[PDB]
């Protein structure tokens, strides 16, 4: 049984977009992830599916570091998912997905998350947002979600 | 209110 939206706390939620969750633990930072299914399980609970962000300082490098966030907005995207219970949603946030070409809308006209690069957890490294790296249907997604942010952010300031 | 556990997958 699956949900195209679910209400909570006087919230409605709909698919592929951002939500903030309470972290499993206590000292972690609100988790972000991107919903991608809204399933019930056999005894009634609703769990969704998310797909995580990755702040910069937590995803491991290769040479087992850590990056530094260019930007205190920025994020990495990532195709690690989860089934998380649906009662852990805080509420929607903001992700904007802009391209390289494209610069970063400012900070008093759109707050919120920005995305330029895309977690390897398999590897432990980047991808940029078009990248030969990509399957098709990953490369797919990254689009997707590309589209969805150039719909809210029409204009284009180039670098 | 009911907390959201991530995963650790397989890595190189």
């Known amino acids: ?159 | 209110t009911k907390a959201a556990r991530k995963s650790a997958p397989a890595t190189g």
């Not at chain 1, 049984?1 to 409605?12: E, I, L, P, R």
């Not at chain 1, 056999?42 to 260019?70: C, H, T």
């Open chain 1, 1 to 159: 049984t699956h949900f195209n939206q679910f209400a909570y706390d006087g919230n409605t939620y709909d698919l592929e977009v951002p939500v903030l969750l309470v972290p499993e633990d206590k000292s972690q930072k609100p988790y972000v992830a991107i919903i991608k299914d809204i399933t019930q399980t056999k005894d009634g609970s609703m769990m969704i599916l998310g797909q995580w962000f990755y702040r910069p300082e937590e995803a491991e490098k290769r040479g087992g570091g850590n990056w530094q966030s260019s930007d205190t907005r920025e994020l990495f995207y990532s195709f690690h998912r989860d089934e998380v219970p649906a009662e852990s949603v805080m509420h929607r946030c903001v992700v904007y997905f802009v391209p390289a070409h494209k610069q970063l809308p400012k900070r008093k006209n759109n707050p919120g998350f920005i995305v330029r690069k895309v977690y390897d957890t398999v590897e432990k490294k980047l991808w940029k947002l078009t990248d030969k790296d990509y399957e098709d249907s990953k490369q797919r997604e990254i689009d997707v979600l590309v589209k969805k942010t150039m719909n809210v952010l029409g204009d284009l300031p180039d670098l």
